[PDB]
A paper describes a structure:
To provide insight into the structural basis of the broad neutralizing activity of PN-SIA28 against group 1 and 2 IAVs, PN-SIA28 Fab fragments or Fab variable fragments were prepared and co-crystallized with H1-HA (A/swine/Guangdong/104/2013), H14-HA (A/long-tailed duck/Wisconsin/10OS3912/2010), or H18-HA (A/flat-faced bat/Peru/033/2010). We determined the structures of the PN-SIA28 Fab fragment alone at 2.5 Å and of its Fab variable fragment complexes with H1, H14, or H18 HA at 3.2, 3.4, and 2.6 Å resolution, respectively. The heavy chain paratopes of PN-SIA28 in the PN-SIA28/H1, PN-SIA28/H14, and PN-SIA28/H18 complexes are composed of large portions of CDRH2 and CDRH3, whereas the light chain paratope of PN-SIA28 in the PN-SIA28/H1 complex is composed of large portions of CDRL1. The light chain paratope of PN-SIA28 in the PN-SIA28/H14 complex is composed of large portions of CDRL1 and CDRL2, while the light chain paratope of PN-SIA28 in the PN-SIA28/H18 complex is composed of large portions of CDRL1 and CDRL3. In the H14 complex with PN-SIA28, the light chain uses its extra CDRL2 to contact helix A. Notably, S52 (CDRL2) and S53 (CDRL2) are positioned within the hydrogen bonding distance of helix A N53. However, the substitution of Ser (H14 and H18) for His (H1) at HA1 amino acid 38 could potentially weaken the binding of PN-SIA28. Aside from the amino acid differences at position 38, the different orientations of His at HA1 amino acid 18 could also affect the overall energetics of binding between HA1 and the CDRH3 loop. Both the imidazoles of H18 from H1 and H18 HA1, which form hydrogen bonds with N20 of HA1, interact with the CDRH3 of PN-SIA28. In contrast, the imidazole of H18 from H14 HA1 shears off, which does not make a hydrogen bond with V20 of HA1 and has no contact with the CDRH3 of PN-SIA28. This seems to be a common trait shared by group 2 HAs.
Here, we present structural information for the human antibody PN-SIA28’s heterosubtypic binding of hemagglutinin (HA) from circulating and emerging potential influenza A viruses (IAVs). The globular HA head domain recognizes host proteins bearing sialic acid on their surface, while the HA stem triggers the fusion of viral and host membranes following endocytosis, allowing release of viral contents into the cell. Anti-stem antibodies exhibit much broader cross-subtype neutralizing activity in vitro and in vivo by inhibiting the low pH-induced HA conformational rearrangement, hence blocking membrane fusion. In our structures, we found that each Fab variable fragment interacts with just one protomer of the HA trimer, and PN-SIA28 recognized conserved residues in the stem region of HA by binding in a very similar orientation to the HAs.
Residue numbers in the entry:
A (entry chain H), I (entry chain J): 43 to 149
B (entry chain D), F (entry chain B), G (entry chain F): 1 to 172
C (entry chain C), E (entry chain A), H (entry chain E): 8 to 325
D (entry chain G), J (entry chain I): 31 to 154
């Protein structure tokens, strides 16, 4: 398989902080990474595809980076509705892998 | 293209191929069917997305500049302020025209390469059991059921299995 | 009837045309447009801090003409001059007008640091019917019109100010050019005035010139506006025996750092865009644009072409 | 407009079978491949099943191979997740998800655009 | 003895050398030169409309100095200044000479809209032996030398002209700098003259200085030439108590639109070329050129290289 | 070249080939002869003309500019008017030097490709009735008279016609 | 790469290969060994060096310029002198960024080509006596002692010598 | 067990990363850096001829202020102004200061061609306690301070000098602005001075203005410095009735030809480099650099990137 | 073999002259030329490898050119220490060839 | 730091043998191929011998083929030039030279970076 490793596993921050999250796999998954937002009890929403391409309708503060080996999800100016658990997705080959979840709490 | 596969010995494309950029299309005893090829499709998209991301990096951000519109003739200074802007716009326009034309020439050659890459991979798989008909299809000189077809498409096909049947059907 | 396996590539019914090195019209499966051609038609007030003079150009705002009361102490990333801006005060010209408006626009601040001067031997706070503030004779809010003592002399002015702060001071002053020798003697009692503003490293001196100019606001005279910068440690001296238009303080020279002026007529909307143009804001992720050569902010590079199609797919051959 | 509706989630005993369904709306379902992804309650998302657009090529997770069976229907535009030999390991909130279309191809292997509401499968 | 079928490519005896990314000298079958290096040595009068001053520079033509009678009411796409151009009238300087030349050249027109002024209280039509028009004391055809009333005063001038037309009026006037206190009082009777020309938005005033300058055409004095623009709706006022060199009308500000001036000495032929240089016209379809940086019209882009060979054929291997 | 046909496994060129850019040269029982190949020659020429037409589009048309020659030192303003023109000329001369060098590198590769394109086509024609000698020539293991030769050059050659004769002559 | 030899059907590279960029690695009766190939290695270095020498030609020499740092705000003229310099730096920075990105895409394509050039040369040498395993190796269906191996590496291998032996071992 | 011959390529343990058209991070075998990021921190005196004013800026050296005795008859390829440079003479300003500096720096020469003038009717060689040369009242080494005849008149000056030579002459002169009407009459006896310097084509006249400026070296007055060029065949005339600061000769206009000025504080070492920057010299064979935009000589082109890796090898796959 | 022909065989010049030397062979040796400096009784020092690449430490006045057929060694501003005999080297294929020597005397 | 030391040059008679040696210092000798180049006294440089990095492939000039023998030691990092069947034609000032290294690899066929001091071989 391909094993994803999200860091950190959780973080608390106030509104307006520069949040950084990492997705971290084994194989060369080129640029196939998909970041997701998830509120409790709700299905995910695609935030970033192609590891950098902003999804249509998603605010410009969400940004993705990385290539091949090291991946990163950065949020510039966090907002109250941005409190959620975040998952990254491998999409280079089957089977599809996800991460351990990176939740943003209130500080 | 430089390799002459797309718009070359591959006559035309397949509009029924909607799950991939490159695919297989077989005819065995059980029937016929089409399947996309992931590796070739992914390699092409990665190189297109890769050059797409390179072209979007937002690097141009200027605030205080020189005036580019004038409500009265002034002479020397205005002539220069205009000639400077005109010089810049022309150079950037060339930098853009050359960029698009060049990237496209490379893009079309990359996709023509990945098509030939896939074909050359399958050629090396069978490697005495089939022959290049020319149109991008291989005449498989042995019975190849759907499990055998899938073995060609997922890269597990062992040519030694059918080598005895295939050579005999070819030579005689 | 031997089994055959074929290899091919996808295609679509209607492809897109792109340019290459060897052809002007090549149909490919998919393509993206790199030249943005659309604008919002409104100026987005985010993230760039905008300021609307909206009846006052920048210089009129700096001097403090009647309409520009709302521009006091304003700060901006982009000042916005309108085509409907109008002079409202005593008629004035500014030698090197575009230089002093490009100093005020770079600094990005109309914070006026008020100072107390002691103009010894002159009347102060003169006003003119050509500069009305509420149907009443007024003047530039940042300039002090000095005339002779009532029925007396124009006591020679030798006022100085030392720059003690850490910033560079921008002083705005002027010189009155009367219309007739009567007005000159009626106002400053000398037949010929003189205004000499100086620092330790640079100076400027003006002797006014009497004569008729076209009537502006029923006034035939003019005021030539000048400006002097003072570096930390330096001193400025206003020396005049007549016709001095005195300052009421100075402005603070700030850092350019996204500070400029844009001459547009579009309304300020409620959108968000990091790129402004004279024709409105641009919201795009494209590298180039044919909207306007006037572009302020994180903008696409202006080109002449209206369409540059980048091929994002293989050759389409149905 | 466009969304995916899920159904079939109930309370079931280990060893038996269930069938969950995902009805599509607002897009050309028979043009896309489709995926089932399960969120084990407490853990994160866990891909379980996926099928091609035509239904000839089916991809399963190693934990459910030979145990679950995915299928689809063009006439009803519905996605079927036939589960046999259930056990409390399979207890999860099931999501039917849609892999994103890229460039002009409707690839099966990509990020997932649209999700269903989430239908919970409980195995005591 | 099996039949053999070979596949190959054509070659020639003497190929051409081109540059690539990995070699300075690669011999290919054929190649085209991209840098034009040849010019006609004549200036083609088509399709661009040319005008030869041929003894008169542009400014001398605008003022009307003796030699420039043939430049009256001329229109051009390109004006041509010769190196053999000579001053022919009263010695004069022009503050910001280059700008006035640029303003006239870009307008592309020497159409002089004549006007009738009423210079009340002066003698008119003065002439100087330094400015001969047919062995006779003359003056600039577009300027009017005003001196005091014969045995009388230099009655003050307060003339105004409103801009009624839709165009911008360019007024060419001047100030006389006499050579001695005698001349100043001999001519305008004031010890110190004054010239004040002004509009509603921009002004200029000059008080002339007396003194010796090097003799040019046996004249020690000078005339400083100035210009004032008047927008539609605005009015210009000529106020002067002495030394004014009055206008006789204005010039019409036109649109740049292939209007400029070229300094060359090459004759004007009968050829046809859409590109002019100081060294002559360029007749080429090549993208680049090493002829001259000075290039007017549809011209190849000036580069520093003399030869850039584009490969138009395969590798040549004999 | 990137394909190594021209200046590669094709030793050198044929100056006798004066009716095209690529051609055949055979030796059968009846004799020997040379004939150009239109398809390959046209594809090369169209891609050279296609990039020749792109490089001629007349787009540079300026009339009022800034002065580029001066008869007296002036200082600040002249320094800028010169430095502006110098900056422009440098950037265009680079734009020209890179353009030629890059278009040539591509041109030589395109022609090398079109050569390899033609060779690959004929290879797919005979199939098992000929072998690659290496020098760009195929050893045809059967009798191929001039009509058979023309069938290879106009693309009508049927390999199934001489398959029995050819395989037998190769294997033994 | 465009040919898919390097980072393609050639799985990985050889760190033990220190005397060249491309080489042979054999297994015969007498043992095993590795030797570099000069021709391929020489061609690749020539084209890299050839493009390195092009990028070093010192052509930028200016002494009198415009002021690029100011101690006091001045307005119009300073705004222009700053805008002129900024416009220049932007264009050269793009020229450099594009040049490197393009020369690298070509460099990686050239080396990928030269690897395929060597493989195709050997393929044409044996030409019935060996089969393409797919990983860049040739199964030689006849005895090939070290002298026979060297004959393949220096281009003196005669296929007609082992043709009878090899075809027999392949077909049966 | 058939023999197998394999074909491959070399690799290394740790490869370098380079950018391509389709990727930001591709590991290749070997790569060369194209951006130079290091400088010597010292200015190399070879092969470019340098001149260190080291307490004198270029203009103070041209006028001949006390500290600049060592700059006389110096010639350079690059003049080096220091940040520690200090005025040492009577306080002075220069209208269009930046141009005179650029004109001097481009000539690359401080060779002063001395001339003998006959200033009839004035006292010569005036000095000032603001300009000390060895604890003694001095003046600019290239300027002559004229004052009225002892207890007499400022006999009018009408001096002329013809340019016989083949080169263009640069004359450096000035105008004294007094501080009080007492000083103006104590020095030149005229209530209002006048300075008129002229050639046959261009001219300039200044009437000085009296008034208080900030005390610099215990002096309230100022001297405005001007310059006049004289082409071969032309003649220059210094005409003044008061306040003239006369020249002692002229400088020779040379050819630019690697002649300029660099503002730096780095010491001049003994190294060798054909490229100078304000931060020091660059010794490189790389095409680009991020050291400084200020680069004089055969320099790499300044770019914004700090690293541009050119791939000099194949793809590295261990 | 490959025969190198250096022209001229010798040359006299003063300090500051634009010196031109040629190396001239038979086969296509496109870029494999090496120029050497030699003082009497001393071993050579590699000046130009690759027929144009300047050796590390060698002054920039030494410049090489040519490709394939016609090679050239150019020296812009000769210096007193540059008085030496110059040898070019073929490096395409064994055996290694050298030239007849081009000395620079005093004029 | 880096340099090559030569030794072995002496006065010898025609027909007999000698051995010269070149000890390396300051670089990975066993990684490079090495050359012997002789400057015939009066004439220019003449390449005589050259060996690969391992010592399996040895290249000789046509004048000395089957007459001289080159070798190299990794344990001692020394280059041996064993000369047999000498004659006054072989009289020369012998130089051990190191072919230059290029971007990645240590090619044997290039210009020669480092030379020895030069040891003279006289054959009376
Ligand atoms: C930017 O370029 C576009 C073309 O690429 C210009 O627009 C079009 O104008 C033509 C007429 O010449 C119409 O037929 C098209 O329908 C227009 N298309 C669009 C999308 O506008 C456009 O005007 C240019 N913008 C500016 C400001 O010049
Ligand atoms: C334009 O470039 C050419 C070179 O391509 C220059 O000319 C040649 O000069 C050399 C001597 O340096 C002569 O040997 C050639 O015969 C010349 N050829 C031609 C066609 O002139 C030419 O001088 C350049 N022109 C300008 C105006 O710079
Ligand atoms: C005009 O004002 C200035 C300052 O207000 C006067 O000058 C000062 O004189 C003292 C004498 O002790 C000096 O120490 C100061 O340095 C001077 N100030 C400056 C700014 O230079 C000056 O004298 C006044 N002018 C007149 C004519 O009285
Ligand atoms: C030139 O660019 C380099 C980067 O390519 C700049 O420096 C480095 O700066 C980072 C901090 O961001 C350090 O971690 C590195 O160690 C630095 N490396 C080197 C080699 O300096 C450098 O500052 C730039 N120089 C200028 C003048 O802008």
């Amino acid at each position: 398989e391909i094993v994803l490793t999200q860091s950190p596993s959780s973080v608390s921050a106030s509104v307006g902080d520069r949040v950084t999250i990492t997705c971290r796999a084994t194989q060369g998954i080129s640029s196939w990474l998909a970041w997701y937002q998830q509120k409790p009890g709700k299905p995910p929403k695609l935030l970033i595809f192609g590891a950098s391409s902003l999804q249509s309708g998603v605010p410009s503060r969400f940004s993705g980076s990385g290539s091949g080996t090291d991946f990163t999800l950065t949020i510039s100016s966090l907002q109250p509705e941005d409190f959620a658990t975040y998952f990254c997705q491998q999409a280079h080959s089957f089977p599809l892998t996800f991460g351990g979840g990176t939740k943003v709490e209130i500080k | 293209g430089l390799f002459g596969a797309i718009a070359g010995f591959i006559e035309n494309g397949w509009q029924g191929l909607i799950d991939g950029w490159y695919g297989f299309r077989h005819q065995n005893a059980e029937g016929t069917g089409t399947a996309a090829d992931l590796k070739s499709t992914q390699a092409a998209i990665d190189q297109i997305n890769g050059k797409l991301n390179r072209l979007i990096e937002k690097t141009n951000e200027k605030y205080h500049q020189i005036e580019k519109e004038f409500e009265q003739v002034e002479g020397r200074i205005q002539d220069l302020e205009k000639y400077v802007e005109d010089t810049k716009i022309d150079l950037w326009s060339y930098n853009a025209e050359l960029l698009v034309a060049l990237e496209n020439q490379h893009t079309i050659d990359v996709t023509d390469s990945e098509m030939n890459k896939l074909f050359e991979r399958v050629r090396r798989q069978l490697r005495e059991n089939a022959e290049d008909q020319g149109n991008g299809c291989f005449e498989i000189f042995h019975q190849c059921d759907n499990n055998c077809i899938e073995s060609i498409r997922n890269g597990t096909y062992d040519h030694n299995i059918y080598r005895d049947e295939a050579i005999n059907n070819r030579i005689k | 009837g031997n089994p055959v396996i074929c290899l091919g590539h996808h295609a679509v019914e209607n492809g897109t045309s792109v340019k290459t090195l060897t052809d002007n019209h090549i149909e490919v499966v998919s393509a993206k447009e790199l030249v943005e051609t659309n604008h919002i038609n409104e100026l987005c007030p985010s993230p760039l801090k905008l300021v609307d003079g909206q009846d006052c150009d920048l210089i009129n705002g700096a001097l403090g003409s009647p309409g520009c009361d709302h521009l006091q102490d304003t700060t901006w990333d982009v000042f916005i001059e309108r085509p409907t801006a109008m002079d409202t005060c005593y008629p004035f010209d500014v030698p090197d007008y575009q230089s002093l408006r490009s100093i005020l626009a770079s600094s990005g601040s109309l914070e006026f640091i008020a100072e107390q001067f002691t103009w010894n031997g002159v009347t102060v706070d003169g006003s003119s019917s050509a500069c009305l503030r509420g149907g009443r004779n007024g003047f530039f809010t940042r300039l002090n019109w000095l005339t002779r003592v009532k029925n007396g002399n124009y006591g020679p002015i030798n006022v100085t100010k030392e720059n003690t702060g850490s910033y560079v001071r921008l002083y705005l002053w002027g010189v009155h050019h009367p219309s007739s020798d009567t007005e000159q003697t009626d106002l400053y009692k000398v037949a010929t005035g003189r205004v000499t503003v100086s620092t330790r490293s640079d100076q400027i001196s003006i002797i006014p010139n009497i004569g008729s100019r076209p009537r502006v606001r029923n006034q035939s005279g003019r005021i030539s506006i000048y400006w002097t910068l003072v570096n930390p440690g330096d001193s400025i001296i206003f020396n005049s025996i007549g016709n001095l238009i005195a300052p009421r303080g100075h402005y603070k020279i700030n850092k350019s750092t996204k500070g400029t002026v844009l001459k547009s007529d579009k309304k300020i909307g409620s959108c968000t865009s990091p790129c402004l143009t004279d024709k409105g804001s641009i919201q795009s992720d494209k590298p180039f644009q044919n909207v306007s050569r006037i572009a302020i902010g994180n903008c696409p590079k202006y080109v002449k072409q209206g369409s540059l199609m980048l091929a994002t797919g293989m050759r389409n051959i149905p | 407009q466009v969304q995916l509706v899920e159904s079939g989630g109930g309370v079931v005993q280990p060893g038996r079978s269930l069938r969950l369904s995902c009805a599509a709306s607002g897009f050309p379902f028979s043009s896309y491949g489709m995926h089932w992804v399960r969120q084990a309650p407490g853990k994160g998302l866990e891909w379980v099943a996926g099928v091609s657009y035509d239904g000839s090529y089916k991809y399963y997770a190693d934990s459910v191979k030979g145990r679950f069976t995915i299928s689809r229907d063009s006439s009803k535009s519905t996605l079927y997740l036939q589960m046999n030999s259930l056990r409390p390991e399979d207890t999860a909130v099931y999501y039917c998800a849609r892999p994103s279309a890229i460039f002009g191809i409707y690839i099966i292997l990509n990020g997932l655009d649209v999700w269903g509401q989430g239908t919970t499968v409980t195995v005591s």
